[PDB]
Write a protein that binds this ligand. Sequence first.
Ligand SMILES: CCC1=C(C)/C(=C/C2=NC(=C\c3[nH]c(/C=C4\NC(=O)[C@H](C)[C@H]4CC)c(C)c3CCC(=O)O)/C(CCC(=O)O)=C2C)NC1=O
Ligand SMILES: CCC1=C(C)/C(=C/C2=NC(=C\c3[nH]c(/C=C4\NC(=O)[C@H](C)[C@H]4CC)c(C)c3CCC(=O)O)/C(CCC(=O)O)=C2C)NC1=O
Ligand SMILES: CCC1=C(C)/C(=C/C2=NC(=C\c3[nH]c(/C=C4\NC(=O)[C@H](C)[C@H]4CC)c(C)c3CCC(=O)O)/C(CCC(=O)O)=C2C)NC1=O
Ligand SMILES: CCC1=C(C)/C(=C/C2=NC(=C\c3[nH]c(/C=C4\NC(=O)[C@H](C)[C@H]4CC)c(C)c3CCC(=O)O)/C(CCC(=O)O)=C2C)NC1=O
Ligand SMILES: CCC1=C(C)/C(=C/C2=NC(=C\c3[nH]c(/C=C4\NC(=O)[C@H](C)[C@H]4CC)c(C)c3CCC(=O)O)/C(CCC(=O)O)=C2C)NC1=O
Ligand SMILES: CCC1=C(C)/C(=C/C2=NC(=C\c3[nH]c(/C=C4\NC(=O)[C@H](C)[C@H]4CC)c(C)c3CCC(=O)O)/C(CCC(=O)O)=C2C)NC1=O
Ligand SMILES: CCC1=C(C)/C(=C/C2=NC(=C\c3[nH]c(/C=C4\NC(=O)[C@H](C)[C@H]4CC)c(C)c3CCC(=O)O)/C(CCC(=O)O)=C2C)NC1=O
Ligand SMILES: CCC1=C(C)/C(=C/C2=NC(=C\c3[nH]c(/C=C4\NC(=O)[C@H](C)[C@H]4CC)c(C)c3CCC(=O)O)/C(CCC(=O)O)=C2C)NC1=O
Ligand SMILES: CCC1=C(C)/C(=C/C2=NC(=C\c3[nH]c(/C=C4\NC(=O)[C@H](C)[C@H]4CC)c(C)c3CCC(=O)O)/C(CCC(=O)O)=C2C)NC1=O
Ligand SMILES: CCC1=C(C)/C(=C/C2=NC(=C\c3[nH]c(/C=C4\NC(=O)[C@H](C)[C@H]4CC)c(C)c3CCC(=O)O)/C(CCC(=O)O)=C2C)NC1=O
Ligand SMILES: CCC1=C(C)/C(=C/C2=NC(=C\c3[nH]c(/C=C4\NC(=O)[C@H](C)[C@H]4CC)c(C)c3CCC(=O)O)/C(CCC(=O)O)=C2C)NC1=O
Lengths: 60, 162, 162, 162, 48, 96, 172, 172, 172, 172, 172
Amino acid sequence: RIYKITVSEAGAYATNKHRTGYRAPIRQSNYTLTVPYDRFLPEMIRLHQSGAKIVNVTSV
Amino acid sequence: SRTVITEVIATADSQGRFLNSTELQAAFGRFERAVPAIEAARALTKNQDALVKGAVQAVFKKFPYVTQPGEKGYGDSNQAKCARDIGYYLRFITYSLVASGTGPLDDYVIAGLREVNRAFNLNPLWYIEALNYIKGETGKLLSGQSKTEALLYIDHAINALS
Amino acid sequence: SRTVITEVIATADSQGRFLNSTELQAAFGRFERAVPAIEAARALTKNQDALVKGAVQAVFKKFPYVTQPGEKGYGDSNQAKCARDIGYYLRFITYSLVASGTGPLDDYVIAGLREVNRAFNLNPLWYIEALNYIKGETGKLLSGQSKTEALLYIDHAINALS
Amino acid sequence: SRTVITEVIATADSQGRFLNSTELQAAFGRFERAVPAIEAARALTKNQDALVKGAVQAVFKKFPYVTQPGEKGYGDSNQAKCARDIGYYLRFITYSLVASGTGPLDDYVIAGLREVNRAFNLNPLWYIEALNYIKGETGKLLSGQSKTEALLYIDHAINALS
Amino acid sequence: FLNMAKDLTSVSRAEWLAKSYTQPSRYQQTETFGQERIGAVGAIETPR
Amino acid sequence: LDLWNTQGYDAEIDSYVDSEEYLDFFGEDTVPYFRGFKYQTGQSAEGFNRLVRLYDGWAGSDTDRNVGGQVARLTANLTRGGSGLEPFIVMANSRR
Amino acid sequence: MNDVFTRAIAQADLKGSFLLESDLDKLASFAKEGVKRLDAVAALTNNAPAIISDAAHKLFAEQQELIQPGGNAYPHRRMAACLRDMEIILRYVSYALLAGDASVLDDRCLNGLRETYNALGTPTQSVARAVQLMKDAAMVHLKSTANVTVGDCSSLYSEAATYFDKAAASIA
Amino acid sequence: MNDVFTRAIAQADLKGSFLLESDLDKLASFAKEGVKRLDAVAALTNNAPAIISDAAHKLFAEQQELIQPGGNAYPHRRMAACLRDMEIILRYVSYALLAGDASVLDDRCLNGLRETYNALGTPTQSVARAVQLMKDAAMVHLKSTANVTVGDCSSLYSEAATYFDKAAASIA
Amino acid sequence: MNDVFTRAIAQADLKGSFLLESDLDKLASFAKEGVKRLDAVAALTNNAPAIISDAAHKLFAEQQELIQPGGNAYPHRRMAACLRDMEIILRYVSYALLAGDASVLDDRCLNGLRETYNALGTPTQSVARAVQLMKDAAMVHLKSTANVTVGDCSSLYSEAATYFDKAAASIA
Amino acid sequence: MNDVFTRAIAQADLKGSFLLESDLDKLASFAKEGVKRLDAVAALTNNAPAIISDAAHKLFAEQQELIQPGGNAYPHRRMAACLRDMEIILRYVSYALLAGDASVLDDRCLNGLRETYNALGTPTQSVARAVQLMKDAAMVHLKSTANVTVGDCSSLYSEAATYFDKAAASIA
Amino acid sequence: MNDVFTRAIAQADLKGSFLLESDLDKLASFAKEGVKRLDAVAALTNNAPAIISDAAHKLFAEQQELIQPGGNAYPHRRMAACLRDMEIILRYVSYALLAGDASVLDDRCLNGLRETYNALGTPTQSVARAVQLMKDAAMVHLKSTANVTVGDCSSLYSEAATYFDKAAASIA
Ligand SMILES: CCC1=C(C)/C(=C/C2=NC(=C\c3[nH]c(/C=C4\NC(=O)[C@H](C)[C@H]4CC)c(C)c3CCC(=O)O)/C(CCC(=O)O)=C2C)NC1=O
Ligand SMILES: CCC1=C(C)/C(=C/C2=NC(=C\c3[nH]c(/C=C4\NC(=O)[C@H](C)[C@H]4CC)c(C)c3CCC(=O)O)/C(CCC(=O)O)=C2C)NC1=O
Ligand SMILES: CCC1=C(C)/C(=C/C2=NC(=C\c3[nH]c(/C=C4\NC(=O)[C@H](C)[C@H]4CC)c(C)c3CCC(=O)O)/C(CCC(=O)O)=C2C)NC1=O
Ligand SMILES: CCC1=C(C)/C(=C/C2=NC(=C\c3[nH]c(/C=C4\NC(=O)[C@H](C)[C@H]4CC)c(C)c3CCC(=O)O)/C(CCC(=O)O)=C2C)NC1=O
Ligand SMILES: CCC1=C(C)/C(=C/C2=NC(=C\c3[nH]c(/C=C4\NC(=O)[C@H](C)[C@H]4CC)c(C)c3CCC(=O)O)/C(CCC(=O)O)=C2C)NC1=O
Ligand SMILES: CCC1=C(C)/C(=C/C2=NC(=C\c3[nH]c(/C=C4\NC(=O)[C@H](C)[C@H]4CC)c(C)c3CCC(=O)O)/C(CCC(=O)O)=C2C)NC1=O
Ligand SMILES: CCC1=C(C)/C(=C/C2=NC(=C\c3[nH]c(/C=C4\NC(=O)[C@H](C)[C@H]4CC)c(C)c3CCC(=O)O)/C(CCC(=O)O)=C2C)NC1=O
Ligand SMILES: CCC1=C(C)/C(=C/C2=NC(=C\c3[nH]c(/C=C4\NC(=O)[C@H](C)[C@H]4CC)c(C)c3CCC(=O)O)/C(CCC(=O)O)=C2C)NC1=O
Ligand SMILES: CCC1=C(C)/C(=C/C2=NC(=C\c3[nH]c(/C=C4\NC(=O)[C@H](C)[C@H]4CC)c(C)c3CCC(=O)O)/C(CCC(=O)O)=C2C)NC1=O
Ligand SMILES: CCC1=C(C)/C(=C/C2=NC(=C\c3[nH]c(/C=C4\NC(=O)[C@H](C)[C@H]4CC)c(C)c3CCC(=O)O)/C(CCC(=O)O)=C2C)NC1=O
Ligand SMILES: CCC1=C(C)/C(=C/C2=NC(=C\c3[nH]c(/C=C4\NC(=O)[C@H](C)[C@H]4CC)c(C)c3CCC(=O)O)/C(CCC(=O)O)=C2C)NC1=O
C-alpha cells in the first residue's frame, strides 16, 4: 500500500548540513512524504542515514 | 562525531552490509593506537593553563597592534575571550585525540568557523599563530608517537583555519 | 580491487580532500600487518598442491552422489576442472592475503558468483565443503596472526558462497 | 551580466514567454535611472586617480602595521598592487553604475572573492576601509540621485567583502 | 633607448608598476570566454 | 545495465532519483540542472568533456527523430578512459 | 547574456580601462531613446500571433512541398513544431531588440540550432525563408504609427531587421 | 548515533570541561578490551547466515501460524522480508557491539521500526522472539574458542545480550 | 584504481599464476618502507596551502600576462578556479604517492584534463609551469627533517618527482 | 505572494466588483510615496550585516547562557546557524517592506519556523528577542536623515516595526 | 518501434496514399498466421535457459581461450556478463519474432553493439558464434511438434533465422 512518513530533523541532519554546507536551498524541518510499499524500505533507510527523525508512519 | 569506528559503521550501513576485514582492520588500528593518543590527551590536559597563557601571549606578540585602544584585543573581556577560545581549541584537540578522529574538531570548531569569524571580525591568523605555539610546545612536551598524534591534529586545525 | 589503500583513497577523493590522519593510520596498520599476510600467502602457495587435492577429495567424500554417471562429478575432465576451480579459489585467497583486502575475491570470484553457478548448475555447497576443508588445514599450515588473516578471507569466500 | 534588462529577459525566457507589461515597466525604470547613474559614473571616472590614492592612504592610516617591513603592505610591488585593487573596485563600481545592475561586480569581483582573499591572505577589512573612503568622497563629489546610485553600488561591494 | 631610460628613471617606480599591472592582457578573454566556447553560457546562467 | 536487466526500468530510474548525488544537489524541491559544467568533487576530468560532448547547445535537443536515430556518444571514451593519445602527449612534451 | 551596456563593459575590461566619455555618451543616447525601443518591443510582442500566422500562410503558399505527405511539416506534430520554432525565433528577436545586442540570439536562440536542423533534416533554406517572412510581417507592425507618439524610429527598424537577418543567416 | 568515545566527549562538552581522569581511564579500559571486541564482532559478522537460519528454523518451529496461508511469513515475499529483517537487526547489533554504544542502535532502526511493524500489522512479539533466538545463536557462536586464543569475555557477552534485549524491547 | 599490490595481482592473474617469490619480496619491501611513504604523504597534505601559495606566487610573477585584464586567471572567479586546480592536482599527486602507482592520478585527473583546458581556452603551458613550481615547493617541505626520524628517502623523492613530472607532461 | 495592489484586487474580486475610486486613490497614494519605500528598503539592505552584527552583540551580551557550552548557540556551527537565521528574517522583512504586504514574509519564512525550532530545541523567546534587537538596529538605520532628502516617513517606520513585531510574534 | 503493420502504414503514409488491396491481403495473411507466430515465440521464451546453456557449453568447449585467465569470459564477472548478453540478444530476437519486424532488435539491441564490444576488447567473432549456436538450439526447439498441432511453419523458421543472423551480422 501507500504509507505517509512524517519526518523531522532535530540536529543530526542539522550537523550534517553544517559540515557539508547548504547546498540546496534551506527548508523547514517537519515534513511528510508519501511512499509506496515498493519504495518503503529504501526511503526509510535513506532517512535514517541522513540523520532524519521520523515521528510517525501512517498506513492508508 | 565521525571517527574511525563511526566511519566504519557508517560505511558498512551505507552499503547495507556487515563489518568486513578492512573495517576490522581500521578498528584494530584505532584500538591499539588509543594508548599514545590518550596519554597525549592527559599531558595536554595537565598543561592546559600554561599552554593557553603562552598562546595568548604569542598572539599578543606576533600581533602587537590588536592590543592598542580602539582595536579588538584591547579590554579585559576581549582577552578573556581570547583565553577561553584558545582553551576551547585545546579541549577539542584533546577530544579528537581521545576519539582518534578529527570528528570533534570538525564538528565543534571547523563547521561554521569561517562565517562566524567573518561575522565577528576575528582574524583566523590569530588562532593559527596560537595553534602553532601549542604545536611547538607539545613537540617538546610529548615523546614518541604521542607527539605525532598531537601534532597531526594541530596541523589539521591549522589547515582548517588557514 | 578495493583494498585498504584503495578504500582510503576513494573516500578521500569522493569528499575531495587530502588524505587525513585516520586514513594514514589505517594505511600504516595495513603496512605493518602485510608481513603476516605475505607469510600466509607464501605458505598457501607452497602447499597448494596437497591443498587442492585434499579439497577435491573432501568434496567427493561429502557428496558421494556427484561421482556417479549422469552427474556433475562423473568424468575425468569434470575432475580436472573441479581441481581447476579449487585452485582458482586458493589463488584468489592468496591474492586477498597479499592485498590486505578482499577486493581480489570480490572482483574475481564473488562478483557474478550466483548467476554463473546457476547457469552451469554448480552447487555452492560443493565449494563451501572444499573451502571448509582448506579452512581445516590452514591451522595445520599456519600459525599466529597469519592463520587468522587467512581464515578471514576463507570465511569471506564461504559467506559469499552461502 | 545580471542587470535590469538581462534579469527581465532571463525571467521571460525561463518561463518561455514574451515580454509583457511588468518587464517593460522594469526596463522603463532602468532607462530613466540611466541618467543619474551614467553621470555618477562619469564623475567617478574623472576623479579616479585622487580617489584611488586617497583610498590607499586611508588603508594605511587605519592599518599602519602593514607598511613596516615583513608583511603585506611593505614594498613598492605590494603598494602598487593595492592601487591596482582599489582601481579594480572603482572600475567595476562604475561599470555596475552604467549597466544598472550589480552584474559587473558580482561577475568580476565578488565571484570567488573569499577563496582568493583567503589563499593570498588579503584581509577584506583593508578593502572595506578603502570603499568606505570612496563612499566619503563620493558623498561630496556627487549630488542628488547620482550620489544615491553610487552609494548603493559601493555598499554592495562592501557587503560582499564583509 | 632614451625613451626606455626616461620611463625607467624619470618617474617613480610606484605608478610605473601600477600602470604595468593594468596593461591589457594579450589573452583578450572576457569573463564569459570559455563558457561561450563550450556553448554553455545559458545552461550555466539559468535560474535555479 | 545490470540493474535494468535484473530489476526492470523502474528500479533503474529509482537509482538515479534515490541516489545520494541527486538528493545532495537537487533534494526533493529543486529542478535538476546541468552541474557538470563546473568541477564536481569526485569528477574524473573527462566528465566535463563528456558533458560538453553530450550537450549540444541551448537550441540542441536529445530527439530520437534525428536522421540516423538515437545513438550513443561516449562508448569508446568511457571504455577506454580517454582518447588514448596521452602517452604520446607525454612523449611529445619531452624532446619532440 | 549581454545587453549593450554589458557588451561595452566587457570590451572596456579587455583594455583594463574605464568607460570613455564618448562611450558613455553612446550609452546615454541608447537610454534616452529607450521608450521607442520599448514601443518596438511591445509591437513585436503584442502582434506575435498575427506575425506568425502571416508568415506561416505565406511560407506554405510559396513552398507547398512542406505540407505534402513526406514534407517537413506534414503531420500535425511537425507543423506544431514548425510553429513553435517560429514563435521561439520571434520571441528571442524581441529579447534582442529590448537588450540592444544580438548576444541573446547567439548565446541561446542560435546556439545549436543549425546542427539541430541539419541532424533532423529540416530544410534550413525554408526556415530562413520563414524568418524573412516574419521580418516582413513585423516591419509593418513596427512602422505602425497608430496609437503611439510619432517620431523617427528608422534605427529601430534597421536593428530589428538585422536581428532577423542574423537569425536567418545562422540558420541557412 | 555516536561511539563510546564520542559519547564521553558529548557529556564532557555538555559540562564544558576537559575529559576527567576517571573517564579517560574508562576509555583506556575499553580500548584495551578492543581486541576481544573485534573478535566478538568478527564472530557475529562471520557466522551471520547460520545464525539467521537457525533462528528462523526455531522461530517457525515454535510458531507455525506465520507459515500457514494467511500467516505473516507467507508467501515467499513475506518470508524473505522476515529473513531480511533479521539480517538487518543482526547487522545493527554487530554495529552497536563494535561501537560499544546503545544509541547507535536506537537512532538507526529502532526509532521507526515499531511504528513500521504496527502499520504493517506484523506481530511485534514474534519479531522479539526472533531476535531472542538470534541472541541465543549469537552466544553459541560467540563462546566458540576454536581458532582464537582463550580468555574471558564476560563483559562482551553481557553487552551483546543487552543490545539484543534493547532491539527486542524497542520493537515490542 | 590500482596500487602496487593490486597491479602485481593483475599481472599475476593475466599469467594465471600465484604470486612468485620475488613478487612477494618486492611487495614486502614496499610494505616495509610504507612508513616513510606515509611520512611523505603527510608532508604533502600538511603543507598543501604553502605549496599552492608558493607555486602561485612564482607562477604569476613569471607570467604576469595571466592576471592582467584579459588574462585567463584575471577575474576573481577564474583565479579561484586556478587555485582550485592546483589543489586538485596536488591532491591526486599525494594519492599517487600513497598508492605507490600513478594509476589513480592518470585515470581520475589527467586523462582528459588537457582537452578540458583546450576547450575552455586555458594555456596548458602555464598549467604545466604551475605543476612544476608545485613540485619545487613540495620537495622542500618533503625533505624537512624536523618532526620525523632522520633517514633515507631518496627513492620517495624520485617517485614524487616522477608523479609531478608526469602531471606536467600530461597537462602540457 | 501578494503586495498591496494584489491584496486589494483580491478583495475586489471576492466581492465581484470593480475597484472603487477610494481604492484607486489609496493605491495611487501608495505608488506616489513608493519612492520613500525604495529609500527604506535600500537602507535596510545596505546595512544588513551591520544590523545583524549589532543585534548579535546585544543579544549575546544580554543572553549570556547561549554562548556557554551546552547553550543553543555554543557549538560554533550553531552560532553560524543563529547568524543565518537572523539574516533570513531580515531579508524577508525587507521583502515584505518593499511589497507593503506581510504575506511574503509569512507564507515563505514563518509558517513552519515555530515547529522547526520546537523540534530542534531552540529557545524561541531568544529568537524573538533577536528579532526585536534587529528591529531596533533597523529603525536606527532607516531614520538616518543623511544620504536622502529629508521627509516624513512615519508610515514606513510603523510598517517596518509591524513586520518585525509580526515576525517575532510568529516565531515566539 | 515497428511491427509489420506499422511499417506498411509508414510506406503508405510516405506515398500519402491508402493501403492497397494487396498490402491488406498480406497483413490479413500475417494475422492469420499469428497463432503459429505465437507458438514460435513461446517456444523461444519457454526454452530460453536451455538454449543459453547449450550455446554457452558449445561455445566454451569450442573456444577454451575465453575461460582461461586472460580470456574475455574468465573471471565470474565476465562470464556473467557473457551469459547476460546472450540472454538479452535472444530476448530481443523473440521480440522481433512476435512483431514480425527486426526494428526493435536494431534500435535497442544492435544499435551500437559492435563498437561496444570493440571497445571492451570483446571478440565480436566469438559473439557472433554464440549467436549462431543460440540459433541452432532455437531451431531445435522451434521445430518441436510435441504440445502443438502439426503444421507447416517454415516461413517462421526462416524469419527466426534471419533475425538471428542479422544480429550476428551486425555484431560481426
Ligand atoms: C524559510 C527560512 C527558514 C528559516 C528561518 C529556518 C530556521 C532553521 N534554524 C535551524 C537551526 C538553528 N537555528 C538557530 C538560531 C536560534 N538559536 C539561537 O539561540 C539564536 C538566539 C537563535 C537565532 C536568532 C540555531 C542555534 C540553530 C542550530 C540548532 C542545533 O543545531 O541544535 C534550522 C535547522 C538546520 C538544518 O536542518 O540543517 C532551520 C531549518 N529554516 C528555514 O527554511
Ligand atoms: C566552541 C568553539 C567556539 C569558538 C572557537 C568561538 C569563537 C568566538 N569568540 C567570540 C568572542 C571573542 N573572541 C575574541 C578573541 C580575540 N581576543 C584577542 O585577544 C585575540 C587577538 C583574539 C583571540 C586569539 C574576541 C575579541 C571576541 C569578541 C568578539 C566581539 O566583538 O563581540 C565569539 C562571539 C560570541 C561570544 O563569545 O559571545 C565567538 C563565536 N566560539 C565558540 O562557541
Ligand atoms: C574466477 C574463478 C572461476 C571459477 C571459480 C569458475 C567456476 C567454473 N567452473 C566451470 C566448469 C565446471 N566446474 C565444475 C566443478 C566441479 N566439477 C565436479 O567435479 C565438482 C563436483 C565440482 C566442484 C566441487 C563443473 C561441474 C563444471 C561444469 C560446467 C559445464 O559443464 O559447462 C565453469 C564453466 C566454464 C567451463 O566450461 O569450464 C565455471 C565458470 N570459473 C572461474 O573463472
Ligand atoms: C578584478 C578582480 C581582481 C581583484 C580585485 C584582484 C585583487 C588581487 N590582488 C592580488 C595581489 C595583492 N594585493 C595586495 C593588497 C594589499 N596591498 C597593500 O598595500 C594593502 C594593505 C592591501 C590593499 C588595500 C597584496 C599585498 C597583494 C600581494 C599578495 C601576495 O602576493 O602575497 C591578488 C593575488 C594575485 C596577484 O598577485 O596578482 C589578487 C587576486 N585580483 C583580481 O583578478
Ligand atoms: C579531477 C581532475 C580535474 C581538474 C584538475 C579539473 C580542472 C577544471 N578547471 C576548470 C576551469 C579553469 N581552470 C583554470 C586554471 C588555469 N587557468 C589559469 O590561468 C592557470 C594557468 C591555470 C591553473 C594553474 C581556470 C582559469 C579556469 C576557468 C576557465 C573559464 O571557465 O573561463 C574546469 C571547468 C569547470 C570550472 O570552471 O570549475 C575544470 C573541470 N577538472 C577535473 O575533473
Ligand atoms: C508599459 C510599457 C511601456 C511602453 C510601451 C512605453 C513607450 C513610450 N513611448 C513614448 C513616446 C514615443 N514613442 C515613440 C515610438 C514611435 N514613434 C514612431 O511612431 C514608431 C512607430 C514608434 C516606435 C517604433 C516615440 C518616437 C515617442 C516620443 C519620444 C521621443 O521621440 O523621444 C513614451 C514617453 C511619452 C512622451 O512622449 O513623453 C513612452 C514611455 N513605455 C512603457 O513603460
Ligand atoms: C530502515 C529501518 C528498517 C525498518 C523500519 C525495517 C522494518 C520493515 N519491515 C518491513 C516488511 C516486513 N517485515 C516482516 C518481519 C517478519 N514478520 C514476522 O513474521 C517475523 C518474526 C518477522 C521477522 C523479524 C515481514 C513479514 C514483512 C512483510 C510485511 C508484508 O508485506 O505483509 C518493511 C517494509 C518492506 C518494504 O515495503 O519494502 C520495513 C521497512 N527494516 C529496516 O531495515
Ligand atoms: C584483523 C582482525 C582481528 C583478528 C582476527 C583478531 C584476533 C586477535 N585476538 C587477539 C587476543 C585475544 N582475543 C581474545 C577474544 C577471544 N577470547 C575468547 O576465546 C572469545 C571466543 C573470543 C572473543 C569473544 C582474547 C581473550 C585475547 C587475549 C587477550 C588480549 O590479548 O588482549 C589478538 C591480539 C594478539 C596480537 O596481535 O598481538 C588478535 C589480533 N583481532 C583482530 O583485530
Ligand atoms: C599517524 C600516522 C603515522 C605516521 C605519519 C607515521 C610516520 C613515522 N615514521 C617513522 C619512522 C621513519 N620515518 C622516516 C621518514 C623521514 N625520514 C627522512 O628524514 C625524511 C625527511 C622523512 C620522510 C621523507 C624514516 C626514514 C623513518 C625510519 C625508518 C624505519 O623505521 O626503519 C615513525 C617512528 C617509528 C621509529 O622510527 O621507530 C613514525 C611515527 N607513523 C604513523 O602511525
Ligand atoms: C535606484 C533605487 C532608487 C532609490 C533609492 C530611489 C529613492 C528616491 N528618493 C527621492 C527623494 C526622497 N527620498 C526620501 C526618503 C526619506 N527621506 C527621509 O529622510 C527618510 C529617512 C527617508 C525614508 C527612508 C524622501 C521623503 C524623498 C522626497 C520625496 C519627494 O520628492 O516629495 C527620490 C526623488 C528625487 C527627485 O527626483 O527629485 C527618489 C527617486 N529611487 C530609486 O530609483
Ligand atoms: C497464451 C499463448 C498462446 C499460444 C501459445 C497460442 C498458440 C495456438 N496454436 C494454435 C494451433 C497451431 N499452432 C501451430 C504451430 C506449430 N505447429 C508446428 O508444429 C510448428 C512446429 C509449430 C510452429 C512454431 C500450428 C501449425 C497450428 C494450427 C493452426 C494453423 O495452422 O493455422 C492455436 C489455434 C487452436 C489450436 O489448434 O490449438 C493457438 C491459439 N495461442 C495463444 O494465445
